[PDB]
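Hi R.,

Here's the input for the 9EF complex you asked about:
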Amino acid sequence: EPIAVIGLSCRLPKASGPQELWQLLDDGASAVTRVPAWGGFLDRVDTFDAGFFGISPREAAAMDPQQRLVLELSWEALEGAGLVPATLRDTGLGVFVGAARDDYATLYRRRVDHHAMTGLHRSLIANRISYALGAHGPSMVVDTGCSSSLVAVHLACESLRRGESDIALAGGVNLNIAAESARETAAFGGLSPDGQCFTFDARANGFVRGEGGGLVVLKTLRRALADGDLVHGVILASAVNNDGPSDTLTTPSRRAQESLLTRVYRRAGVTPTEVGYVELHGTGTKVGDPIEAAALGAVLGTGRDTPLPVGSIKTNIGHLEGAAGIAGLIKALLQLRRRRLVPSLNFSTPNPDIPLDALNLRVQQESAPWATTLVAGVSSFGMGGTNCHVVVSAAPPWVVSARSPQALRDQAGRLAAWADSPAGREASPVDIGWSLATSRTHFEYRAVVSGSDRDELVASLRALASAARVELPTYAFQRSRHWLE
Amino acid sequence: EPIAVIGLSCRLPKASGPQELWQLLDDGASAVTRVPWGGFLDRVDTFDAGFFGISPREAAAMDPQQRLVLELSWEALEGAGLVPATLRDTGLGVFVGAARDDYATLYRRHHAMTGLHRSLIANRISYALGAHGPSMVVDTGCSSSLVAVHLACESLRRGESDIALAGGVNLNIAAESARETAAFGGLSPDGQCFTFDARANGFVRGEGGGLVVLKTLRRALADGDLVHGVILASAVNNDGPSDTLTTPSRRAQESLLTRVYRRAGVTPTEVGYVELHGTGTKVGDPIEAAALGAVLGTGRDTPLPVGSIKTNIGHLEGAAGIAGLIKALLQLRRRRLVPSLNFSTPNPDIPLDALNLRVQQESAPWATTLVAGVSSFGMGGTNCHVVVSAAPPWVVSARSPQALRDQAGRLAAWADSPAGREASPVDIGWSLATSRTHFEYRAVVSGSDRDELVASLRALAVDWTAYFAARVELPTYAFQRSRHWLE
Amino acid sequence: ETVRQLTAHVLGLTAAADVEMTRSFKDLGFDSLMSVELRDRLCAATLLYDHPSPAETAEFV
Ligand SMILES: *CC(=O)NCCNC(=O)CCNC(=O)[C@H](O)C(C)(C)COP(*)(=O)O
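And here is the predicted structure with 9EF in place:
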């Protein structure tokens, strides 16, 4: 049974939103910079708006920043999907978050109140979302590895198909706070000294550090059509398997990937010569990249008149190693929605060990429009051997509210900026007003503007900042520093 | 689609196997002792690295939880009557729930990163067995094992898996974890777990692990496996908007129980036992008792027997669900109810007479099929319930001469035990020939009587399929563990 | 004096000035442990369960 994707949220280096991520990917820019006293690092990871979620500053000080980031991502995802969180209380909403790092606990333990137990456990990452949203559905954290996010997405889809959950939250998160994780990672010697991910390139020497998070809202296609929700995409089928008896536990196996791809394309009703793009899991390594290329050529490259376009998002932001699958799924969904294929960086000379011409595969290194429905595939291979694949097809007076005066003025300014942006110019002002009045929850503080033109409304909103359904620029938080001492 | 459980393995304080666990539970003894307060194992630094082909340095850097899970899976496969060598390149899924990584804390005071990942606890099994099924580790809290069991059952029902290994493990090696547990304020000062009692003042730490083998009931019947039990349904839910993120909710538990007993088709007043999740605290125990009385207590003409294994070994917080499931399976197999310790007077907040519940504090036979329920509530607020009903010449092999003599000794001891006296020697030989794998060093004994065969086995302590019967259990394998600890 | 809301600093709101009356303890953050601690912190000067805001709590004294 197909699963309807209706909304998503993400937080990536140099990309604080889906629009920012699309702008970064379409412009061919890399967010991998040096450590802010190589790799993609977020900005102000120690800042959190604890007042919005009703959390005391003392609890937030010992709180894992990953939990706060996931809570903010979930709030943004539910806001962007047109669903009021207050209407999700006492409902069987499922939460699926895949995390595999707890470096905050190591930082706390290397150098004792009652908040340490609650704030240093992986289950509370999803339990806090369940508590805040009042969800009666299943909530758990799956530890898979580099493919934890895709495993969580597959579990959410299976739960939706079974019927025990009506709305699911699937995604992942990863943060690199402690230098101990970096030291252990460099001990393995799998980091490229150049600090870049040379996917399907002859200069591949390893991957680069990356951090960030992503979440997505999953619902059944029938229920989404019944409720009239705007569908971002359609997940057709997914499957999870393991390499099994390979040469080494770390070394991946081609046969398992081939079988996984064949089985995931068999039940999805998708034949070759109609898949327009495939999201690569390659981390710029000279070991697994040839295996992945050979598997893709054997499964999808065989019997194809035109070369299959391939690419990866790790060339821009890096290997998040805890949220790679959800990031790839978000990139594929954005490409499907915009009907364009973003270029992939770090590709100059083809890998001699990879016969791209023989495998009927080509790396997309130029922004080109997408033409025919369009089918894309996102693959995530865990380090231990777990592999997942997801197939996604394309879908077939202004009131501003906030809990603080400064927050209200920030919301008004951001709304005015979004309206002035060309993205918001494609929607009529009546649609914007309807979305603000129906798809946005009413807070303690509110402001109402009126006018006869869009420019007048924007001017009024900026002055105070000192029916179809359309997207809105999420919520503007007032983050404050909360760190251990 | 009901699931068939055809084998299980466990490692608990003063319980190295299902027989030892049954002996401990029936005798009404407690494994909670002093720190060498709480149940503890003999040793956790000992492992047989040569059995799995693991280098000694890798074993030293290996997480003991991974080794314990691998050993438990091997024991469960050996006792399930399935040859592991025939499980290669098959859709076998592994689901292990773990929530402790104190070995990383010990290391942080190339092999290091491989022996400190929680996911590999399952993934290594897929590497050892060569399985192509899903292998993921689920972190939920105190209900991780039950969640993993439910996920394995659902995967088997869907059809992407043939045989599943579902369970959990938890080890307490670091004193820092004990420090945080004491600072939280949940450890009982008396070092005892008074479930549903008036002396409830916290729980006791416990370490151990468990695993079970899950297969489709129709497929198991077609193959002809020894069905240990039949799991009917399993549901997972969250308390949502409770009073406190830590404080559990009664309405969510009531709804979960109602849905799990409606989906399984088991009406009230025919369930003979319920495995309690009581932690010996005066907060969640009244809520659990009220939920049980409202769901299962109502509409029953007799008091419902309830009990918890935490009164015998203590709270594990990583394998409590699988331990309760194993205890329920053992009770169903033996058709007897073990007593519950640390129970003298009912809690004033718990109206047992009004709730139509009673604590099983005596050893009595079980009479009507028999249906049991196992509950597991997580710390974050995740609840799971599982409903399980009852089923409707000698060759020895090992990889070392010392291992061979140890296996012969354990086999002879099991034969001398009254449990082994119910199986004919021909059945024992058939099980040894077919249900056991032939290792590098094998020996064959000959005799005309059981006593002569046992005496020959103690003295020394080919297509055999066509030589011969039913399938009977055997005392698994005799490991040769060696110390492997970081320096 | 009578109100002397100086023990609210256990909430972590810096000085005891940012704490606001006519509110609810559950919104600003108060579990069982903090409630018990605040009940035992008034020995130097029902009572809290039925009195969410600090105003009614100080109304007793
Ligand atoms: C494995 C696990 O979850 N173990 C703890 C289970 N605990 C309970 O069932 C009781 C929950 N107890 C509490 O919430 C305590 O009363 C607190 C933590 C002291 C908070 O008390 P407050 O709500 O009165």
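One thing worth noting: Residues 394-483 of chain B form a domain with the Alpha-Beta Plaits fold (CATH 3.30.70.3290).

Cheers,
M.
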